[PDB]
């Protein structure tokens, strides 16, 4: 591989909290940053590793585009990257800074560059998944509320499950521990073929389950993969039914179970759906995952398995 030790980190951090995050969230970052508080530095570390994960994923994706010369991709990299890597090194992620330098070093094949890009992205995606689990979203929870009536009102202001072929549905089970909850889901292999491929290849796995903090009632967890598969079928998130399983290679590789009303209007690649029989089981897990992500940080693990 291009960076085998990186892969060792990517493996460890599936089950385990990366040290960076632990020193970040307890204001123990050696450089003691943040103009006698650290929240602002912490906020920065979180948001910027998130956006760097996106950046990198689009560089990874660009790398599949042979109209852009490998050298042009590397040039683009050396330009856009340092402002992110150097700052992240300063603010809690110094290993990432050195590895970012490594990814840029003069490479000799597209495949090699691309292998670095996919590797690095996976690493940063996991740093981002942990960073997301631990950020104090509860802060504006007594300070800044949407008022109930306006909310129900905008809910009042406003098929892709019928496309393709039922014969090609591939079954799987989602298991949420320690809740001991379980549903059986179907994956539309026919809709986004290499997408669902990339997702079933990874199976099984056990990752951490967290909650959306913008779009509404939408759980997502960061799967151990990077897919650049076509996404011909995408569905707007506000139009998603309850129980929809959407992937989002754009934003890491999040297995996004949607269980309740969401407001986001950006389109999302369709993976599958929970079997109607088990959709009602979702509200509970969704509330407990809101609790963990918003509040308690009590980890809730996902296991996805090929039935």
Ligand X SMILES: N[C@@H](Cc1c[nH]c2ccccc12)C(=O)O
- Per CB under 6 A, residues contacting ligand X are 44, 50, 87, 132, 212-215, 251-252, 264
Phi, psi of 69 (to 5 degrees): -60, 145
HSE-CB for 34 with a 13 A CA cutoff = 19
Q: What residue 55 binds from ligand X, its own copies, none (CB within 5 to 8 A, per partner kind)?
A: its own copies
Rounded Cα gap, residues 96 and 88, in angstroms: 7
Residue 261: enclosing H or E segment and its boundaries? strand 254-262
Q: Is the separation of the CB atoms in 70 and 101 below 8 Å?
A: no
Q: Which residues contact 296 (CB under 8 A, 6 or more apart)?
A: none
Cβ proximity to its own copies, 141 vs 204, nearer residue:
141
Cβ proximity to its own copies, 2 vs 97, nearer residue:
97
Q: Which of 106, 108, 109, 148 binds its own copies (CB under 8 A)?
A: 148
CA distances from 37 to 20, 33, 79, 295 (A): 18, 8, 32, 21
Residues 106-135, mask of contacts with its own copies (x by CB under 8 A): ------------------------------
Rounded Cα gap, residues 271 and 268, in angstroms: 9
- Tell me the window of 2-10, 11-19, 30-38, 172-180 that interacts with its own copies (CB under 8 A): 30-38
Q: Is the separation of the CB atoms in 70 and 59 below 8 Å?
A: no
Cβ proximity to ligand X, 169 vs 244, nearer residue:
244
35 binds its own copies (CB under 8 A): yes
Q: How many residues contact its own copies, by CB under 8 A?
A: 74
Residues 79-98, mask of contacts with its own copies (x by CB under 8 A): xx--xx-xx--xx-------
150 binds its own copies (CB under 8 A): yes
Cβ proximity to ligand X, 38 vs 113, nearer residue:
38
Q: Is the separation of the CB atoms in 53 and 124 below 8 Å?
A: yes
Cβ proximity to ligand X, 153 vs 213, nearer residue:
213
The least CB distance from residue 54 to ligand X, in Å, is: 6
């Amino acid at each position: 591989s291009a960076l085998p030790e990186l892969r060792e980190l990517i493996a460890s951090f599936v089950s385990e909290e990366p040290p960076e995050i632990r020193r970040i969230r307890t204001g123990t970052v050696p450089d003691l940053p943040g103009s006698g508080q650290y929240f602002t530095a912490w906020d920065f570390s979180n948001s910027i590793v998130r956006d760097y994960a996106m950046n990198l994923y689009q560089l990874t994706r660009l790398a599949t585009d042979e109209s852009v010369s490998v050298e042009n991709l590397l040039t683009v990299f050396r330009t856009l990257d340092p402002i992110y890597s150097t700052f992240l090194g300063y603010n809690g992620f110094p290993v990432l800074a050195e590895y970012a330098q490594r990814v840029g070093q003069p490479a000799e094949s597209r495949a090699e560059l691309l292998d670095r890009l996919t590797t690095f992205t996976e690493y940063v995606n996991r740093l981002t998944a942990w960073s997301h689990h631990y950020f104090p979203w509860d802060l504006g929870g007594e300070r800044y509320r949407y008022a109930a009536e306006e909310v129900a009102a905008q809910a009042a202001e406003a098929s892709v499950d019928s496309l393709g072929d039922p014969s090609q549905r591939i079954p799987v089970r989602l298991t949420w521990q320690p809740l001991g909850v379980q549903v059986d889901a179907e994956i539309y292999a026919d809709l986004n073929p290499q997408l669902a491929t990339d997702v079933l290849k990874a199976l099984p796995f056990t990752v951490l389950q967290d909650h959306a903090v913008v779009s509404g009632e939408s759980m997502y967890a960061w799967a151990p993969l990077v897919s650049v598969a076509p996404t011909p079928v995408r569905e707007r998130i506000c139009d998603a039914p309850v129980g929809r399983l959407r992937f989002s290679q754009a934003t890491g590789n999040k297995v996004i179970v949607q269980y309740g009303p969401t407001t986001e209007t950006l389109s999302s690649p369709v993976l599958g759906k929970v079997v109607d029989s088990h959709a009602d089981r979702l509200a509970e897990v969704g509330k407990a995952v809101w609790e963990s992500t918003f509040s308690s940080k009590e980890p809730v693990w996902l296991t996805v398995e090929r039935l």
